[PDB]
């Protein structure tokens with residue numbers, strides 16, 4: 181029993197973290213085989229950030245201008261190239277700790293683990309979700325750029341996020357490992373803001389199923405709803421629309437608990453309309469939306485890596 | 486910016502997890518140098534759990550009755566001994582991945598990371614706290630026994646907890662790495678229950694200071710309090726007494742924010758009286774007690790916003 185915000189074990193990613201320095205800028209890099217991946221803004225000064233011409237700044241640089249440090253060892257840069265907002269530094273040493281991996285782009289609502297790093301040294305691991313507005317509610321300080329997000333499937337690490345910046349509201353923005361940003365963001369110092377966010381409905385439903393599995397049923401009722409009627413109330417409370425795909429995905433949890441997805445939707449509707457009335461669900465007074473249906477099934481089954 | 490329940494990177498502990506089997510029982514062990522540490526109840530059947538005589542069960546075992554598996558490799562047991570509720574299995578191979586470590590016994594209120602494991606394989610990492618009633622609100626299924634709790638400071642892993650059992654209320658009990666239980670618990674299936682739990686006051690205060698550092702001050706007031714008056718009100722809401730030690734420990738956060746500890750105590754008193762009125766503090770609708778003053782200083786910026 182018990183339900184916690186659980187991250188994947190970080191060991192396979194810790195053995196890939198390095199420090200990248202170019203001029204006065206120091207951030208983190210991801211060392212896989214003989215390439216070090218890092219945000220391209222490592223080549224910028226503070227004045228360059230306003231309107232940087234990355235292809236012009238990069239030509240000025242030679243291999244020896246990039247200082248890469250893996251633990252207490254200097255890696256020698258032998259090549260460099262840019263792919264979208266990610267800089268790829270070819271080093272003269274393949275990482276002996278390179279795990280089996282893939283680069284994957286995730287969708288809003290999907291969760292992942294973040295290994296927060298400073299000066300190429302991992303400091304902490306936490307779980308988060310890609311919000312519908314494409315930002316993440318992370319915890320990062322100056323020097324955290326280049327820290328990565330990932331999921332593990334069997335023995336394969338799927339890298340899905342690289343940290344680039346913090347927005348004025350304290351939320352974070354970054355790219356996939358191919359350098360494509362999540363959201364309408366750019367890697368410059370310009371006026372940028374997170375869009376209005378919404379709640380991840382399929383995740384709140386998954387978490388309500390996790391509460392039932394852990395013996396919390398007070399919110400269950402005898403009623404049901406249609407998908408259309410539920411979506412009319414969900415949009416009213418700034419919740420993402422629930423699709424037939426979300427209903428299908430919740431199928432197994434509905435069969436394990438004996439509570440149909442639209443029956444759980446009726447419970448969610450009443451929670452939105454009446455509140456919790458001094459009660460909690462899994463120790464929370466808010467409806468939690470950062471656990472996917474797969475996360476709930478995995479934590480209530482004991483899948484190992 | 487941001488504030489998350491952050492765990493330590495788990496890699497150093499992942500390289501120590503092994504599977505220990507004795508008869509029909511399989512659980513996790515911690516392999517450090519040439520010793521595998523695990524709960525002594527690995528030698529018990531379900532019948533034995535009512536009134537086990539561990540000395541009597543152990544004398545009937547030989548080294549070859551214990552099967553230890555590290556990855557896909559069998560370790561050969563060459564010695565065994567019991568120390569309190571922990572079984573120490575001497576193996577003929579020192580763990581080449583043994584980190585720099587120490588065994589530390591923690592006090593209630595202290596936090597640590599747990600690496601939940603099944604069959605010697607890590608599945609997830611999460612942060613938790615030793616409750617005032619010496620239990621932990623973990624997330625553990627059958628087969629998780631032997632999973633460990635730890636902190637990491639400057640590359641040294643301090644092991645503070647080993648998982649032994651789940652109590653009837655869904656909470657968890659275990660030992661330090663010398664086999665001494667936290668709390669009045671026994672590794673016996675008997676009528677034992679977690680005592681009434683309380684809120685960790687010094688941690689709630691630390692978290693209120695984390696909110697001020699991150700820019701939120703809505704909960705402050707113009708009042709102060711005496712330590713005695715604060716404790717009389719705190720005990721009515723099931724909060725632990727605040728000692729002069731806790732006031733001393735909060736000194737640095739009081740100096741970084743300019744808010745005296747007894748001034749923050751007055752804010753906590755008012756929060757207990759009024760609730761949050763639809764507002765949140767660091768994204769929570771409840772007062773959070775699983776971040777220590779040390780955790781807040783480690784995660785938060787040294788510059789207040």
Ligand SMILES: O=C(CN1Cc2ccc(Cl)cc2[C@H](C(=O)Nc2cncc3ccccc23)C1)Nc1ccc2scnc2c1
Pocket residue numbers: 221229320321322323324325344345346347352366367368369370486
């Ligand atoms: O100082 C800057 C300038 N940035 C321009 C800029 C423009 C474009 C790009 Cl792609 C990156 C960046 C950098 C950037 O966002 N870095 C950071 C990333 N994650 C967390 C951070 C936490 C504190 C500081 C920086 C952080 C740097 N901003 C700033 C922001 C957020 C707070 S919160 C307190 N101080 C700041 C100060």
Ligand SMILES: O=C(CN1Cc2ccc(Cl)cc2[C@H](C(=O)Nc2cncc3ccccc23)C1)Nc1ccc2scnc2c1
Pocket residue numbers: 181526534625626627628629630649650651652671672673674
């Ligand atoms: O079946 C038992 C017997 N235990 C007695 C017993 C007595 C003393 C000692 Cl030192 C160890 C143990 C074992 C024990 O607590 N094992 C476990 C440890 N951590 C999490 C667990 C999560 C589910 C299951 C077992 C778990 C075994 N209990 C039980 C409890 C909690 C739920 S929740 C659903 N089923 C159970 C069933």
Ligand SMILES: [Cl-]
Pocket residue numbers: 590591592595
């Ligand atoms: Cl302690």
